[PDB]
């Protein structure tokens, strides 16, 4: 008289916190609760009331034949740090599994537009051993943190949490037994560019702009020597930035500004020497005090395509 239909599992995910982004590894940490509910065969409980079984005691019930399927985080890195866990067994057959978890999760993250980047933090959940003929997800609900003021937070959550329930078919695996039910949660976020605009981009602009002042010096010697102090100032600034900003395998927006600075100061050095060593006149072409910042900003504009 068995029931061979798939077991419908309802899932709720409570996300406490997302943090600890690691840019090079493209990972992030998630702390929260996972709640899974399904209906089994009815049972007798003490006093015909719901029965609570915590932590180690859960293992005793699995040994007695209680079915408690393992649900794997597909995109977790290593074994997640599972805290308290609990089962609730109802007389009518309901079974609810609840667990606190902390894990590091991976996803495709693109930081090229840093510090103005947007990211999709994703949770992917799937049964470890049971295909969708035995265990299928029926619904997914996600509850996040109530935010007071976002100006203090590194990331700003734009929009409600998106969810999906799909099927994953594996070729490497009877017919119709190679398909697993998967839940996908997505939290869209946008970085807080404030800190990076005032402490990094703005001071770097004043530096590059300040380097354009070499054209206002009234001597070749003064123009060429001060340029070297400017160059030294961009290099000293590249260290300050690299020491704080995240490591990546590609350049960001700030990295390109720094390169633009190197190019500006190097270009000015070639112009200072050409003007002075092409003729014997020089001071008049050095009156490019306006032409240089425009050419930089001009190129600076076509870089934004």
């Amino acid at each position, epitope marked *: 008289p068995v029931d061979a239909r798939p077991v419908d599992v309802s899932v709720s995910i409570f996300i406490n916190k997302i943090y600890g982004v690691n840019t090079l590894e493209q990972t992030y940490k998630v702390d929260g609760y996972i709640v899974a509910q399904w209906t089994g065969k009815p049972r007798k409980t003490p006093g015909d009331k719901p029965l609570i079984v915590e932590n180690t005691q859960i293992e005793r019930w699995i040994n007695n034949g209680l079915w408690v399927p393992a649900l794997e985080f597909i995109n977790v890195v290593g074994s997640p740090d599972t805290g308290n866990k609990r089962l609730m067994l109802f007389p009518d057959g309901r079974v609810i599994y609840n667990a606190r978890f902390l894990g590091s999760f991976s996803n495709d993250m693109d930081f090229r537009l840093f510090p103005f980047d947007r990211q999709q933090f994703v949770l992917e959940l799937e049964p470890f051993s049971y295909n969708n003929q035995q265990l299928r997800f029926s619904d997914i609900q996600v509850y996040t943190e109530n935010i*007071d*003021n976002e100006e203090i937070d590194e990331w700003w959550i734009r929009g409600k949490a998106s969810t999906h329930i799909s099927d994953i078919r594996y070729d490497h695996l009877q017919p119709n037994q190679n398909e697993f039910s998967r839940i996908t949660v997505r939290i869209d976020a946008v970085r807080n560019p404030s800190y990076y605009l005032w402490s990094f981009i703005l001071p770097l602009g004043l530096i590059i702009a300040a380097s354009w002042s070499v054209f206002w010096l009234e001597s070749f010697s003064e123009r060429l020597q001060t340029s070297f102090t400017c160059m030294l100032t961009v290099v000293a600034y590249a260290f300050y930035t690299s020491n704080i900003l995240p490591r990546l395998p590609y350049t960001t927006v700030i990295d390109q500004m720094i390169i633009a600075g190197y190019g500006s100061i190097f270009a000015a050095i070639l112009l200072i020497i050409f003007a002075h060593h092409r003729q014997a006149d020089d001071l008049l072409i050095q009156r490019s005090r306006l032409a240089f910042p425009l050419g930089f900003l001009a190129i600076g504009s076509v870089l934004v395509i």
Partner: nanobody, 121 residues
Framework: QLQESGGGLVQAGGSLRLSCAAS????????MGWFRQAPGKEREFVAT????????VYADFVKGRFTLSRDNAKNMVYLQMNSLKPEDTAVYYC?????????????????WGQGTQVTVS
């Protein structure tokens, strides 16, 4: 600025619906909480929203008798108070959480309202 209303006199066992109008820079009603202060006693917490979605924090004397709700459209919160008893007589204030790390601490609230009196016989 915050303004309370909905207080008054009620018979032991009756109900009241306090209202707190919020005006100004307030992105969400989550920051708002209810307090009460009887004559001679200190201002004690009553209710505010919980950190995680779906949760609400209530003082231990509430015992399920009060219910905090919010109308983000009108940018407001309501304290539905039932099964009132003489012990609940006090001035009920509405506050706005201005930082800190304690939802239940009056020290972390500013912009208090004038308060609205609740009196139970």
């Amino acid at each position: 600025q915050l303004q309370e209303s909905g207080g008054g006199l009620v018979q032991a066992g009756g109900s009241l619906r306090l209202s707190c109008a919020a005006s100004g820079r307030i992105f969400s009603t989550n920051v708002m909480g209810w307090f009460r202060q009887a004559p001679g006693k200190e201002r004690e917490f009553v209710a505010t929203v919980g950190r995680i979605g779906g949760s609400t924090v209530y003082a231990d004397f509430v015992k399920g008798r009060f219910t905090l709700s919010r109308d983000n459209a009108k940018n407001m919160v309501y304290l539905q108070m039932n099964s009132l008893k003489p012990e609940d007589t006090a001035v009920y204030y509405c506050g706005a959480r201005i930082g800190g790390s304690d939802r239940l601490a009056p020290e972390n609230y500013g912009y208090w309202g004038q308060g609205t009196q609740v009196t139970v016989s």
